[PDB]
C-alpha cells in the first residue's frame, strides 16, 4: 500500500477511516474523472467516487488524494470525513460545502441588474490565503490554486472559503493550467511556494472579476508568450488599486521578488480596513 509524507511522519491507507458502505446513502448528484454526490452517513457529506472502469494508476491516484486531504488540519482546507475503499465503486467522503465551488458561485452571484460586496470578496481571498499560508508553512505546494478548486460552506454572509481539490499535487507526487502558472513553472517545471503565490494572484483576479476566465480572449500559448514577455492582466472592472497591487506583486517575474503568504494576508487585511476599497461598488451586468 502507498505511503505518504506530510509535515513530518508517514501516513498509511490503514490510517484512513474506513466507513462501512451500509452506513452511506447517496442523495443527489452534485455534478472530471468520476462523480460527486451529496450523501449522508446523520452527517451530511460530499461523496467523490472512483469509476469502476479505471486503470490501476487511477486507483492509486484516488487513494493518494484521500491520504493527502486526510493529513491536513486547517479551517480553510476541506475536511475528509473518511473513505469507503473496500467496496466498489470507491468513495472518498468530504465535508459538504453547500455553497459549491468558488467559480460557479461568483458567476451565479454577480450583482443582478434588477447581492455581494467588496468586503465579501476580500474575505474569500483572505480565507484562501490563510489556507495557502498553512500549506506553505507545512512545505506543501498545491500547484493549482484556482477558483475552480475552492469551495464555499454556504451562499450567504457567513460563508467560509476553503481549498477543496488536490489533484495536481497528487499527480506530481505520483491539460496544464498554464494561465495560473508562473514562467519558471511552465518553462522549467520548477515549483516552489512562490509558484502558489503567482497562482493566488490569478485567483485574486478571478475573484474580483467575479468569475471571468483569466486572460480573456487569449489562448494558452498566447498567454505563455504574453507572460514570458512581461505581459500581465489589467485590473478587473472596478477593482480597487490596493487589490490590483497585491495581484501585480504576486506576478513578479522573479520568484524571490514575490510575497510569501504571510505578507499577502497582511496586505489583504489592510484592504479590508480601507473604506475606499470596501465601499467600492461591484459592476452589474
Ligand atoms: C470533490 C468536489 O467536492 C464537493 C462539491 C460540493 C458542491 C458542488 N456543487 N455544489 C452545489 C450543490 C447545490 N447548491 C449549489 C452548490 C456543492 C460541495 N462540497 C464538496 N466537498 C469538488 C467539486 Cl465538484 C468542485 C471543486 C472542488 F474543489 C471540490 Cl473538492
From TrEMBL:
Which superkingdom heads the taxonomic lineage of this protein's source? Eukaryota
Biological process GO annotation list?
A: cell surface receptor protein tyrosine kinase signaling pathway
Keywords on record: ATP-binding, Cell membrane, Coiled coil, Disulfide bond, Glycoprotein, Kinase, Membrane, Nucleotide-binding, Phosphoprotein, Receptor, Signal, Transferase, Transmembrane, Transmembrane helix, Tyrosine-protein kinase
Residues annotated as binding ATP: 48
Any one GO MF term held by the record is: transmembrane receptor protein tyrosine kinase activity
Family per record: Belongs to the protein kinase superfamily. Tyr protein kinase family. Insulin receptor subfamily.
**What's the protein here called?**
Tyrosine-protein kinase receptor
Amino acid at each position: 500500500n502507498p505511503n505518504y509524507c506530510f509535515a513530518g511522519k508517514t501516513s498509511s491507507i490503514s490510517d484512513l477511516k474506513e466507513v462501512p458502505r451500509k452506513n452511506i446513502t447517496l442523495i443527489r448528484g452534485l455534478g472530471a474523472f468520476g462523480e460527486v454526490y451529496e450523501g449522508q452517513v446523520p452527517l451530511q457529506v460530499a461523496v467523490k467516487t472512483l469509476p469502476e472502469v479505471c486503470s490501476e494508476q487511477d486507483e492509486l491516484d484516488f487513494l493518494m488524494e484521500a491520504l493527502i486531504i486526510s493529513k491536513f488540519n486547517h479551517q480553510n482546507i476541506v475536511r475528509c470525513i473518511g473513505v469507503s475503499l473496500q467496496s466498489l465503486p470507491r468513495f472518498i467522503l468530504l465535508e459538504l460545502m453547500a455553497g459549491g465551488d468558488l467559480k460557479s458561485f461568483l458567476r451565479e452571484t454577480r450583482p443582478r441588474p434588477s447581492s455581494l460586496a467588496m468586503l465579501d470578496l476580500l474575505h474569500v481571498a483572505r480565507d484562501i490565503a490563510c489556507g495557502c499560508q498553512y500549506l506553505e508553512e507545512n512545505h506543501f505546494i498545491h500547484r493549482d490554486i484556482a477558483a475552480r478548486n475552492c469551495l464555499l460552506t454556504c451562499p450567504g454572509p457567513g460563508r467560509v472559503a476553503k481549498i477543496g481539490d488536490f489533484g495536481m499535487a497528487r499527480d506530481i507526487y505520483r491539460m496544464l493550467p498554464v494561465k495560473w502558472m508562473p514562467p519558471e513553472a511552465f518553462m522549467e517545471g520548477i515549483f516552489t511556494s512562490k509558484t502558489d503565490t503567482w497562482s493566488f494572484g490569478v485567483l485574486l483576479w478571478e475573484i474580483f472579476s467575479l468569475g471571468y476566465m483569466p486572460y480573456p480572449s487569449k489562448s494558452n500559448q498566447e498567454v505563455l508568450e504574453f507572460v514570458t514577455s512581461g505581459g500581465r492582466m489589467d485590473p478587473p472592472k472596478n477593482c480597487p488599486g490596493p487589490v490590483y497591487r497585491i495581484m501585480t506583486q504576486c506576478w513578479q517575474h522573479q520568484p524571490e521578488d514575490r510575497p510569501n503568504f504571510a505578507i499577502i494576508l497582511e496586505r489583504i487585511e489592510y484592504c479590508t480596513q480601507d473604506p475606499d476599497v470596501i465601499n467600492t461598488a461591484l459592476p452589474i451586468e
